[PDB]
Design a protein around this ligand. Structure first.
Ligand SMILES: [Ca+2]
Ligand SMILES: [Ca+2]
Ligand SMILES: [Ca+2]
Ligand SMILES: [Ca+2]
Ligand SMILES: [Cl-]
Ligand SMILES: [Cl-]
Ligand SMILES: [Mg+2]
Ligand SMILES: [Mg+2]
Lengths: 7, 236, 236, 7
C-alpha cells in the first residue's frame, strides 16, 4: 500500500 | 565502523551484489558504510540506501505484526495464560526494529539532510525521515507517541512543500512521497479523509501532466499513480 | 551462551513464534539454546531444530549461488576486470554458511547423536549430519573436499543402514533420507546412476507399502514420493 | 529437489 521498496 | 577500512566504491559495488543475492541486511550495512564516508550520495546511491533499509525494516514490521497479533489474541477473554514469552519476543523484535529506524534517522541527521540542497535529494531524504518515523509510530504506545507522530508529519510536510514548489506533479519521488504521506494520514494519524483527499488530488494532478512525459517516464509515473488508485479503492 | 538464562520450554515456545514470524535466524538461536540444555529432543523439537537451520542455511546457499555465478561470469573471456569485491563478498557469505554448518555439526557431535538410541531419532540426526556436510561440500574446493564428501556419504550410509533395518519403507524420515542421499549422489558425488537407482527403488518399495497406512500417513508418504518422482523425471 | 525444509 505504500511506495515500492525498489524503484 | 566495521566498513571504515573498505573503499566507498567497493561498498557500493557490494551493496549491489547484496541486492542481487537478496541479502538486505548486508546491503544496508554496506550502504551505511558508504554514507559514513561523508560524501553526498548520487541518485542511484540514495536509492540503494533506501532499498536496503526498506527491506530490512519491512521484514521486521511483518514479523512484529505477526507477533503483536498473537499477543493481542492472548489477551482476549477465554485465552489461556502462556507466560511472558510472547510479550518478550514481540519486544525483542520491536527493539531491533526501533534500532534500525534510529540508525537510518541518525544517518539522515549526520549529515545527509543538511548537505542536501537540490530538490531531488532533499525531498528524498525528508521522505525517508517521514517513513522511518512512521515505522516508529506503528509500534509506539508510550508518552512519546504523539511526538513521534508529529516528527513524521513534520518531515513529510517539509518534503511536500519543497516537492510542490520544485518538482512536476508526475515526478516519481513526489508521487511516492504523497502516497506514503496519505498512508500516514490513514494508518497513523487517524485522518482517513485527509488521506483520501491527498491521494485523489495527487492522482488528478499527475494525470494532467502525463502528456509532457516520454514513454519511459510515463511508465514510471503511472506505476505509482496506480498505487494511489488502489488505496483509494480500498479506502472508499 | 546468550540463551543460557532462558528456560528450555520458553526457548521452544519462542522457536515456534519465530517460525510463525519467518524469523529463522532467531528460531535457530532458540533451538540451539534448547539443545544446549543437555536433554534429548522430542520428535517435534527435532523438527523445529531442522526447520530453523534448513531455512538459515538454505538462504545462505541461495545467496552463495547468486554470487558464485557472478564470479564465474567475471572469469570468462571478454569479461572486464572489476577488482576483488565479487570474490570477497562470495567468500564472506561462504564463511558464514560454513560457520552455520559447523554449528549444526557441533550440536550433533555434542551430544545429540551419542544419546540418540531410537531409530527415529538416530536416523534423523545422522540425516542432519549428512545434509550439513553436503552443504559444506557444495562450496568446498580445497584439499579437504574429498574428506567432506566422504563425511556426508558416511553419515547418510549409516542412517540408511539403520532406516532399512528399523523403519518401514514409507516412513517419511526414511523417504527424506533416501531423497537427500540421492541428491548427494547426483549433485555432489558425480554418481547420477546411483542417484537414479536409489530414487527408483525407494519409490517402488514405498509404493508397495502404502496399503498398510492410514489416510494421513498415506498423505505424508506420498508427498515425499512425489519429490523422488520429480527428480527421476528431471534426471532421465 | 531435496527434502522439504518443513514437514
Ligand atoms: Ca538479510
Ligand atoms: Ca550539497
Ligand atoms: Ca532470519
Ligand atoms: Ca537416549
Ligand atoms: Cl525473546
Ligand atoms: Cl565483503
Ligand atoms: Mg524542478
Ligand atoms: Mg520400527
Amino acid at each position: 500500500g505504500s511506495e515500492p521498496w525498489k524503484q | 565502523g566495521a566498513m571504515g577500512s573498505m573503499e566507498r566504491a567497493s561498498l557500493i559495488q557490494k551493496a549491489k551484489l547484496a541486492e542481487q543475492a537478496e541479502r538486505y541486511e548486508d546491503m544496508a550495512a554496506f550502504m551505511k558504510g558508504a554514507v559514513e564516508k561523508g560524501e553526498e550520495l548520487s541518485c542511484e546511491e540514495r536509492n540503494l540506501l533506501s532499498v536496503a533499509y526498506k527491506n530490512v525494516v519491512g521484514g521486521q514490521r511483518a514479523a512484529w505484526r505477526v507477533l503483536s497479533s498473537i499477543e493481542q489474541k492472548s489477551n482476549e477473554e477465554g485465552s489461556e495464560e502462556k507466560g511472558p514469552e510472547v510479550r518478550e519476543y514481540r519486544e525483542k523484535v520491536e527493539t531491533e526494529l526501533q534500532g534500525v529506524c534510529d540508525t537510518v534517522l541518525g544517518l539522515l541527521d549526520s549529515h545527509l539532510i543538511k548537505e542536501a540542497g537540490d530538490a531531488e535529494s532533499r525531498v528524498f531524504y525528508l521522505k525517508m525521515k517521514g517513513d522511518y518515523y512512521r515505522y516508529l509510530a506503528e509500534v509506539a504506545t508510550g508518552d512519546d507517541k504523539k511526538r513521534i507522530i508529529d516528527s513524521a508529519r513534520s518531515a513529510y510536510q517539509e518534503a511536500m512543500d519543497i516537492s510542490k514548489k520544485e518538482m512536476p506533479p508526475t515526478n516519481p519521488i513526489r508521487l511516492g512521497l504523497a502516497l506514503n504521506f496519505s498512508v500516514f494520514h490513514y494508518e497513523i494519524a487517524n485522518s482517513p479523509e485527509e488521506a483520501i483527499s491527498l491521494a485523489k488530488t495527487t492522482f488528478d494532478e499527475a494525470m494532467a501532466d502525463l502528456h509532457t512525459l516520454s514513454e519511459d517516464s510515463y511508465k514510471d509515473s503511472t506505476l505509482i499513480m496506480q498505487l494511489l488508485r488502489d488505496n483509494l479503492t480500498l479506502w472508499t
